[PDB]
Design a protein around this ligand. Sequence first.
Ligand SMILES: O=C(c1ccccc1)N1CCOCC1
Length: 209
Amino acid sequence: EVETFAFQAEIAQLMSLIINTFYSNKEIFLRELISNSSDALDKIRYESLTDPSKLDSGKELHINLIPNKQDRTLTIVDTGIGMTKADLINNLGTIAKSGTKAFMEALQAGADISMIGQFGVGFYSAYLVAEKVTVITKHNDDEQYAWESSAGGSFTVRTDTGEPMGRGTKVILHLKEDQTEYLEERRIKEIVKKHSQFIGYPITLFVEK
Ligand SMILES: O=C(c1ccccc1)N1CCOCC1
């Protein structure tokens, strides 16, 4: 049972801008997704300080980066707070309408795309490198869901019958054909070292057979 939703017009406009603007410094997508994972992990950590049962779904707080060259996917897994179905529908838990407004003003006032995270909409930087993004998530107060979009103005939400996650979020980037450098170990290591060196959770880069 799959539900299809239209993006709000402002978010569709954000996504078109990210997809269509010539901008070479695409590697910042990974900084932005790791930062989102860190923010999610901070939220479940804070809730656990007064209610340790919040971690019954998983005590470890970490980020895994999983490249798969056969499927052409880079997956960012975290064990943070996750998202409810309502959060997924409401722009993946962001204030994306107001964030887009400010970001588009800033781009016209000199800013560049790399600044997207200062506007709370860094998730959408995934579309610098992905033709399709799938988000699998599990929040303590809801069931496991899959969100997906290839842009084009719509996204889907369905219950996920895949491997249960416990708690957290998995962002699966189905990379564009010309963006496969982001599956190479040396390139991922370089980006994490350059942009994510002060993230306070372990970031494990998985290797491939
Ligand atoms: O920062 C930029 C930017 C674009 C062109 C020239 C200088 C900067 N952007 C990223 C891509 O989307 C638009 C905003």
